[PDB]
Automatic annotation (TrEMBL), chain A:
One of its GO terms (cellular component) is plasma membrane. One of its GO terms (molecular function) is copper ion binding. Its EC number is 1.10.3.2. Keywords: Metal-binding, Oxidoreductase. This is Two-domain laccase. It is an enzyme of class 1 (oxidoreductase). Cu(2+) 1 binds at H64, H66, H118, H251. Cu(2+) 2 binds at H64, H196. Pfam families: Cu-oxidase_2 (PF07731), Cu-oxidase_3 (PF07732). It comes from Streptomyces griseoflavus. InterPro entries: Cu-oxidase-like_N, Cu-oxidase_C, Cu-oxidase_fam, Cu_oxidase_Cu_BS, Cupredoxin, TAT_signal. CDD domains: CuRO_1_2DMCO_NIR_like_2. Gene3D superfamilies: Cupredoxins - blue copper proteins (2.60.40.420).
Length: 281, 278, 277
């Protein structure tokens, strides 16, 4: 898909918090297309995003971002009078920025990386009940020259669920051998977990690729993660291992048993998966 | 900026273990002056420090540090007769070393970082009564050319508290927009936590800040941590996000909800906090 | 000294058996099983065929982290690659050197501190097979890697170190100045914080910085949860001297209840000063 360009476009989008089946809550880019996870927000460093947000719930909701620049007005908390009342609208405003030398000669970390947004005022003032119900979603902020993927898949460990799904309902994601798949992995709630993928590995750093033969970042297939931790990577599907149904799961042993498990379906060029007996789950 | 010198002085300090109000145990720089956490001890790589310790409790205590060089005699553990009787005194010596190449020709990591000290002898032989009641403190060992801060603030997640404080008592931490703020973050006791800061982000490396455009240290705003973990960072306060009461909190949902929160009170240059009730 | 560049096809026989005391483990010969299992060491490019035998009365299997295996070597009941009671199976592991793709991007190497474990006993994620000790280490070395005087594996399995009864180590001995490798794996149900007295290491691939432009953190305390694996190499007693150098999980209760051990660093004349158990 090429590579990211340099940023600096004032983007704007519409966001709504809606009720979902089963008492669940979610964000969507249009009324009635709310999902869990929320819609993937993607940005290039420099970009500015106005988020026009409406609350269709009977309770106040908010919209709070990790890792992006925001004045306190866009804090998204009761503490800075920045929530959205029932039936209310409010425009939030996020900025990103590039790395660069400061006047004291110290490097200013840019805004790039794998981030998230969630609610901060439902249930409690730290968003506990809203986060549990599914008011969360991913934010990617690229830097110029970042390799771009063929696909992007978000995997939130929210307590003992994957993306609030029922135990052992995945989700599963598909690809084809060689694809540049990207994974965003976020964690929410009470518990710590350990994210693990069969047959694939990545570098523990911003992009999940090594920069080169002098990138000392370690190569893992298992990452521990806690509430609100976010990381991402990109892998080449089946690189060095082939097609097949490739397990991902939480490696905390009671958590894969209770069903924090899903499948990375990496397919041959003809769309088949060898040995994928769908009844092996 | 104005950085940290090279090291290699011999330094000396007096530290006491005391009871404070209501079952509290703590280290101080002089008597009566005990604090939780204990006093910040700061060095530059290669400095030797001679801690002249005195136990003022009616039970044994020790002084044990992370990451610095000490010889086995200054473990601060009962298991090798390093603890201190009630009323006793003992000098613990910690050393620091610069980075450098070795005998076999590999690079030997400097003793620089964000470290800590704690008791190892109260309640149990791993300091479980002593860690739980406040007998811990921060340690920073600066390299050469380390950027120096305007202020330093220690945040310790000691099981379910920040600095053995009551629930929902901060601490709160003040700065002006533009101040170079260093944060010493230590976890202790029983729970993993995940450290969070509103509006501010830092590098997951030694300094908390990147070396330049080839430093691949991840930039994060949320860090999982477990007992005896120590990291730290420098951020430019309200840089790119402005003045206001910026929350920091354990992002474990019940933990924040149960009071593991405090406010980073950041000022416009006139000493006021937009949107906050001072 | 230094590790070579890989490329051999290496064969080995592997056995799952019951141990005394009702546990389970892997060995290289029959009656020689161990918890953890034996250390498997590879160079980047090395292929290893694992001639594997289930001597247990239930399906066991072998599943590896890090390495390149085809879905046929997956080790899961899910992909029908577990081994029935009494059966044999060859699991094949490959490794790859790093290198730049036609992509232009940089492909990471198989090198690392890895581990194998059972995926089919107890449950279909090997929870009962890991619990009773069916686990063990792997070190894939990159061309030129430093090689040590010793390697020791410390597995945090729930609240046991190497499935050992509480407060019984294991202790490992060394002489001042030795180069000592530690493989640290965690398994099971709990998070942990692995800590060593008197010693520190780099939080990167090898546990040692490349030099003064390696920005890696230096630590002596690392939080790890089920299936985490890492390693390092420390110079024994470096700058700190001989002694009984304690290592433990740093969750207070976990240390209190026997997740402790010792790193016994001898003076060259074999004395460990002031040590008396
Ligand atoms: Cu928050
Ligand atoms: Cu989990
Ligand atoms: Cu948050
Ligand atoms: Cu200790
Ligand atoms: Cu917490
Ligand atoms: Cu300690
Ligand atoms: Cu698995
Ligand atoms: Cu533990
Ligand atoms: Cu596994
Ligand atoms: O696994």
């Amino acid at each position: 898909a090429g590579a990211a360009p340099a940023g600096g476009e004032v983007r704007r989008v519409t966001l709504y918090a809606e009720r979902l089946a089963g008492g669940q809550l979610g964000y969507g880019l249009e009324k009635g297309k709310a999902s869990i996870p929320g819609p993937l927000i993607e940005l290039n460093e420099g970009d500015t995003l106005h988020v026009e947000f409406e609350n269709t719930l009977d309770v106040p909701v908010s919209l709070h971002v990790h890792g992006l620049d925001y004045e306190i007005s866009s804090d998204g908390t009761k503490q800075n009078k920045s929530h959205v009342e029932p039936g209310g609208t409010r425009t939030y405003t996020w900025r990103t920025h590039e790395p660069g030398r400061r006047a004291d000669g110290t490097w200013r970390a840019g805004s790039a990386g794998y981030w998230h947004y969630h609610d901060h005022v439902v249930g409690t003032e730290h968003g506990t009940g809203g986060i549990r119900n599914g008011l969360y979603g991913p934010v990617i902020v690229r830097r110029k020259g970042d390799v771009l993927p063929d696909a992007t898949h978000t995997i939130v460990f929210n307590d003992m669920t994957i993306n609030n799904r029922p135990a052992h309902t995945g989700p599963n994601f598909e690809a084809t051998v060689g694809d540049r798949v990207e994974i965003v992995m976020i964690t929410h709630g009470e518990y710590y977990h350990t994210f693990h993928m069969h047959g694939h590995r990545w570098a523990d750093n911003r992009t999940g690729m090594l920069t080169g033969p002098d990138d000392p970042s370690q190569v893992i297939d298992n990452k521990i993660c806690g509430p609100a931790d976010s990381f991402g990577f990109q892998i080449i599907a089946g690189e060095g291992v082939g097609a097949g149904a490739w397990m991902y799961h939480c490696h905390v042993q009671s958590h894969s048993d209770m069903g924090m498990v899903g499948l990375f379906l990496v397919k041959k060029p003809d769309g088949t998966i060898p040995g994928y007996d769908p009844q092996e789950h």
